[PDB]
Design a protein around this ligand. Structure first.
Ligand SMILES: Cc1cncc(C(=O)N2C[C@H]3CC[C@@H](C2)N3[C@@H](c2cccc(F)c2)c2cn(CCc3ccsc3)nn2)c1
Ligand SMILES: [Cl-]
Ligand SMILES: [Mg+2]
Lengths: 300, 302
């Protein structure tokens, strides 16, 4: 029993983190095979990054894997990520893929400083394409990932903090999540919305763990609920979301539209001094799979 | 900016998790140098578990009865000993991935990271606190016995918890790595219950300081309090007493923020009296007590 915000074991990624220093800036890079990936804004000196990089020589890039130093033998740019070719293939390179995640999906973040891992936590790609992480100066290049079996799927590289304190980054191919640029300009997180399918998944997690007070005899329609959803700044619930929740509906005897009626009442009446899984708010950073994985016991 | 329940990177502990099998029972062990540590109830049957005589049970075991598996490598047991409620299996191979480590017994309110493990394979990592009633609020399923809790300040792993069982209220109990249970619990199936829990006052105060550091001041007030008047109010909300040690420990965060410790206590008093009025603090609608003062400085400063 118990339900907790749980990150993937980070060992396979710790062995890939390195420190990258160009000019005055130091941040983190990801060492896979014979390439180090890091944010292109490490580029020394409204920037024209292709033009700034030609001035740079391989030996301007200091790369350290612990005490050991890696020799840069080439450099290239892919969107907002810089790729440093090094002389040595990382002997601890895991089986891995680069993937791009969708809003509402979760991943583990390995927060790093000076190439040394310092913490791991779970976070969701918000509908406004930010994440609510915990990053200080020097965390740029920290990465986000999921693990399926022995395969690490890298999905996020951290680039910047926005004025509201939330965070923005790219996939490992250098494409930003959301309408952001890697520049000193005026940028702001858009208005956010609540990830409806994830709230429902969390209510099923609560039921599985004995928290049942919010259940009621009623059910609703997808059309009726989604009108309540938009009213409360909740993402629309689609039939595909209903399908994904199928497993949990079968396991608990609570149909999704049966649970939507519960969520409707919670949105309209509050929780009246009660809590669900130790929270006084509705939590939307657990996916249906996160709830199945943790209420069943998958391992890596 | 931001403030999150942050676990330590788990790789140094992942390299130590093994599977231990006795009879029909399989659980997790911790492999450091040439020793595998696991809960001694791995030698029990469910019948034994009402009033097991562990000394009598262990003397009947042969080394080859213990099947220890590290990945796809079967380790061979060459001896065994029992220390309180932990079984120490001597193996013929030292773990080449053994980190710098220590065993530490922690006090209520301390936090640590838990590496949930099944059949010797890590599943996930999350942050826990030792509650005042010597339980933890974890996420543990059947087969999680032997999972460990740890901290990694500098590059040394301090092991502080090994998971043994789940109590009737859904909370969890275990030992330190010397085999001594936290709290009054025993590794028997006899009736046992967690005591009434209380809120870890010093940690709430640390978290409120974290909130100020992150730029939130809505809960401050113009009042102060004596330490004794604070504790008279706090105990009425089932909060732990705040000691002069707790006040000393908060000195650094007080200095950084410019808010005296007893002024922050006055703010907490008001929050307990009023609630949040539909507001949040660091994204929570409740007062969070599983961040220590040391945690706050670690995450908000370095
Ligand atoms: C939800 C959960 C959370 N954390 C840990 C668990 C989890 O796996 N066990 C913990 C619990 C509950 C089941 C079992 C193992 N118990 C063992 C137990 C019971 C009472 C006190 C105690 F100190 C330990 C236990 C071990 N044996 C021997 C025969 C046997 C072996 C495997 S099943 C039966 N008999 N009882 C479960
Ligand atoms: Cl302690
Ligand atoms: Mg209903």
């Amino acid at each position: 029993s118990g339900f907790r915000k749980m990150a993937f074991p980070s060992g396979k990624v710790e062995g890939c983190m390195v420190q990258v220093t160009c000019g005055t800036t130091t941040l983190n890079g990801l060492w896979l095979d014979d390439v180090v990936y890091c944010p292109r804004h490490v580029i020394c000196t409204n920037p024209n990054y292709e033009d700034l990089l030609i001035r740079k020589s391989n030996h301007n890039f200091l790369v350290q894997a612990g005490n050991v130093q890696l020799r840069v033998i080439g450099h290239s740019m892919q969107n907002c990520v810089l790729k440093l070719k090094v002389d040595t293939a990382n002997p601890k390179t895991p089986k891995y893929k680069f993937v791009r995640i969708q809003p509402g999906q979760t991943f583990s973040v390995l927060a790093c400083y000076n190439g040394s891992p310092s913490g791991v936590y779970q976070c969701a790609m918000r509908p406004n394409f930010t994440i609510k992480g915990s990053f200080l100066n020097g965390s740029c290049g920290s990465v986000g990932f999921n693990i399926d079996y022995d395969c690490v799927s890298f999905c996020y590289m951290h680039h910047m903090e926005l004025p509201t304190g939330v965070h923005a980054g790219t996939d490992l191919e250098g494409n930003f999540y959301g309408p952001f640029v890697d520049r000193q300009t005026a940028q702001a997180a858009g208005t956010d919305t609540t990830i409806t399918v994830n709230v429902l998944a969390w209510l099923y997690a609560a039921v599985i763990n004995g928290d049942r007070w919010f259940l009621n005899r009623f059910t609703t329609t997808l059309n009726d609920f989604n009108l309540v959803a938009m009213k409360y700044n909740y993402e629309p619930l689609t039939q595909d979301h209903v399908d994904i929740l199928g497993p949990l509906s079968a396991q608990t005897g609570i149909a999704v539209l049966d649970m939507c009626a519960s969520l409707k009442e919670l949105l309209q009446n509050g929780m009246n001094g009660r809590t669900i899984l130790g929270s006084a708010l509705l939590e939307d950073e657990f996916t249906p799979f996160d709830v199945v994985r943790q209420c069943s016991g998958v391992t890596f």
